[PDB]
Amino acid sequence: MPMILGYWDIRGLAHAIRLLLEYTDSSYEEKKYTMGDAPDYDRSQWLNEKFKLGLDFPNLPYLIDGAHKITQSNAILCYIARKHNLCGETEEEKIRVDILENQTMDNHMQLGMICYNPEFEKLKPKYLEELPEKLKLYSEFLGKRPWFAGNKITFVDFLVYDVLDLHRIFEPKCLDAFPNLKDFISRFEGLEKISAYMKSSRFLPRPVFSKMAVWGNK
Amino acid sequence: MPMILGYWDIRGLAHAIRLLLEYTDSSYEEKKYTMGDAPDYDRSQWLNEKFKLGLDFPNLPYLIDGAHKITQSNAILCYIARKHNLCGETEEEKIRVDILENQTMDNHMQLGMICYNPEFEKLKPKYLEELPEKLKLYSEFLGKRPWFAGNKITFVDFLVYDVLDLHRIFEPKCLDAFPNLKDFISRFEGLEKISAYMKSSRFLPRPVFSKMAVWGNK
Ligand code: NA
């Protein structure tokens, strides 16, 4: 019965999924892949079973729940969310969820691109220069709402939390100009099932990225 | 009052949206922004309006429909699709829709990455070496189904059509090994409203990408 979540033994793209699985009290186990160390960074464990699990578009992370085999982190989150009415009910909520689902991936991928290239320190200045405007848009989108879709928490709160928390690790002061984002993080981490998970042995906040990353590899 | 689709005067990320608006007999008009040529690629036409349209995360394309102001092309597609029950009904359809919404963006962005890269000619051979396996995944996922979510067309058929068609422009023979994908294209282009639109003066198949592209800029 327990679902299987497959991913590298890192935080990465599985962080929001792990948090949502824990928030919804879902029964799951993790299939963990380990990347080899430098200089080769072997990925054989995944690449050689990548095509042996019945996934339609093999990729990490994946979720196996009975006959349902899902890839793409956002499709995984949506699947879990539908089981728990975490998807937005009003048309307004649904639009906000769809926008943020795609926007959070853009901003995550932009950080991933800066952290996997070797000129990271050469490219980091322009990134931090353009970062406050990115966070301001999140802060203004939230405004006075408790959650990003409106009055009710949805799966995109888990995506926005991950994006925000990644950046306060990346730059510790980046949220100081945005008190409503700091309060959002405080309220998210204070949710009973989330707080219990973050204080448990399963909590895997680091490394942020794979061994292949210039930043966040450890 | 027609909806407003705003984008560059190219095919780009708006193709699937244009096709879906046409299939659904939507009332819309297009706000076309023109981009300057190299090396500056002037976008001041967009920049002078970018923050004055009510968009939460200003970006192109956008869709304005009364009070609803939407960015992210997948969010735009979902908004139009919900008006016409084109998002999938059963859980099984919804999973396939969710996977494909994100998978098609992945493959779209992977072609965009090499076509916008200055070393395009250096990178093309390996991309073409890996292309058959990518398309095989779409062919095996479709199987003998008429549409990608199952027995009824959904908005992700428009997304898959665009990615496949982009690649037969890029590599004309690339679908030859996959008859069910060729048949799918025939079915998509054989929809009455798509057929009429493709013969219309509104059809805009080229340029594939923006003026900044190395491949597909004209
Ligand atoms: Na939808």
Residue numbers in the entry:
A (entry chain D), B (entry chain A): 0 to 217
What does the paper say about this structure?
Glutathione transferases (GSTs, EC 2.5.1.18) comprise a family of widely distributed phase II detoxification enzymes that catalyze the conjugation of a broad variety of reactive electrophiles to the nucleophilic sulfur atom of the intracellular thiol, tripeptide glutathione (γ-L-Glu-L-Cys-Gly). The present study aims to evaluate the ligandability of the human GSTM1-1 isoenzyme (hGSTM1-1) using a broad range of structurally diverse pesticides as probes.
The enzyme was crystallized in the P21 space group resulting in four molecules (A, B, C, D) in the asymmetric unit. D–A and C–B form the typical dimers found in GSTs. The interface area of D–A and C–B dimers is 1341.9 Å2 and 1313.1 Å2, respectively. The interactions between dimers are mediated through helix α7 (residues 178–189). The most noticeable difference was observed in Arg42, which is involved in the formation of a salt bridge with GSH and points closer to the active site cavity in the high-resolution hGSTM1 structure than in its low-resolution counterpart. The compound binds to the enzyme at a distinct site that partially overlaps with the H-site.
